[PDB]
Each structure stands twice: as structure tokens, then as C-alpha cells.
Amino acid sequence: EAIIEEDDGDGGWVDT
Amino acid sequence: KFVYKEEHPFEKRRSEGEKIRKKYPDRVPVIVEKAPKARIGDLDKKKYLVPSDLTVGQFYFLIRKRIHLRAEDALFFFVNNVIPPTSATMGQLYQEHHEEDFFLYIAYSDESVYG
Known part of the structure; x- marks a missing residue:
């Protein structure tokens, strides 16, 4: 499971 | 409608959406809710x-x-209370229906009518 920009306090963006 | 638009201000969302659109130009940012x-x-x-x-x-x-859905279970997407064509690209959907915060919003339901 890759997550992008997880630092932002939003759980990050699921990279597909 | 979407809780993401309530839990986050418009100004914050719009800034993040522009940031993402400029950094990942080949990608589309999509908010997905039930x-x-x-x-x-x-x-x-x-x-x-x-x-x-x-x-x-x-x-x-x-x-x-991702939600451990069986095939016997139904799933529909809604973009503005309308089921998008399955042949459509996420990019085309963004170009047409991205909100002003530069995100594409999509609801999903087990029913063919949003509610």
C-alpha cells in the first residue's frame, strides 16, 4: 500500500 | 453532501488541490465517500x-x-447524483466535474439512486 503526501494531516493520498 | 467539504475549509482544500494538480500533472485527485x-x-x-x-x-x-465487496454485492458511483459512464476516464471526469477546490468528488452506494 503506497500513500503519497502522508505528512499532510489527511491520511495521505492512496497512490494507484 | 460530502463530509470532506465540511471537515476541511474551502481555502485549505483549494490550495492543496492546486498543489497536487501542479506536482502530479498526469494524475487526478479524487475524494471518495459513501x-x-x-x-x-x-x-x-x-x-x-x-x-x-x-x-x-x-x-x-x-x-x-478495497472494501471487501463480493460480486453478488452491487456498487454504483455517482458524480453529481449521476452514474458516470464506465468507459469514461478519471481525467475526463475531472475536466468536466472537478469542483472549484480542484478535487473530483465521487459518491458510491449499493443503490442505483443516490441517497
Whole structure:
């Protein structure tokens, strides 16, 4: 499971 | 409608959306939520960075996998209370229906009518 920009306090963006 | 638009201000969202659109130009940022009257399982993650060439049908498949949905179970997407064509690309959907915060919003339900 890759997550992008997880630092932002939003759980990050699921990279597909 | 969407809780993401309530839990986050417009100005914050718009800035992040521009940032993402400029840094990941080949990708589309999509916020995904369950419709209220929907009786299917919820998605832990709501934000998805998807290739602009990804199709509605491919996205149906991934979301089905991600909420542990059986084939006997139904799933519909709604873009502005309208089921998008499965042949459509996420990029085309963004170009046409991205909100002013530069995100594409999509609801999903077990029913063919949003609620």
C-alpha cells in the first residue's frame, strides 16, 4: 500500500 | 453532501488541490465517500491519486477490492447524483466535474439512486 503526501494531516493520498 | 467539504475549509482544500494538480500533472485527485442511504462498507481512505487514464470500470474494481465487496454485492458511483459512464476516464471526469477546490468528488452506494 503506497500513500503519497502522508505528512499532510489527511491520511495521505492512496497512490494507484 | 460530502463530509470532506465540511471537515476541511474551502481555502485549505483549494490550495492543496492546486498543489497536487501542479506536482502530479498526469494524475487526478479524487475524494471518495459513501452515500448516506448506502448499506455497504465504508472506505478507510477517502483521497485517491489516480492516473488520468484510469477508467470508471477500473476504479469500480479497485474500490470493490478495497472494501471487501463480493460480486453478488452491487456498487454504483455517482458524480453529481449521476452514474458516470464506465468507459469514461478519471481525467475526463475531472475536466468536466472537478469542483472549484480542484478535487473530483465521487459518491458510491449499493443503490442505483443516490441517497
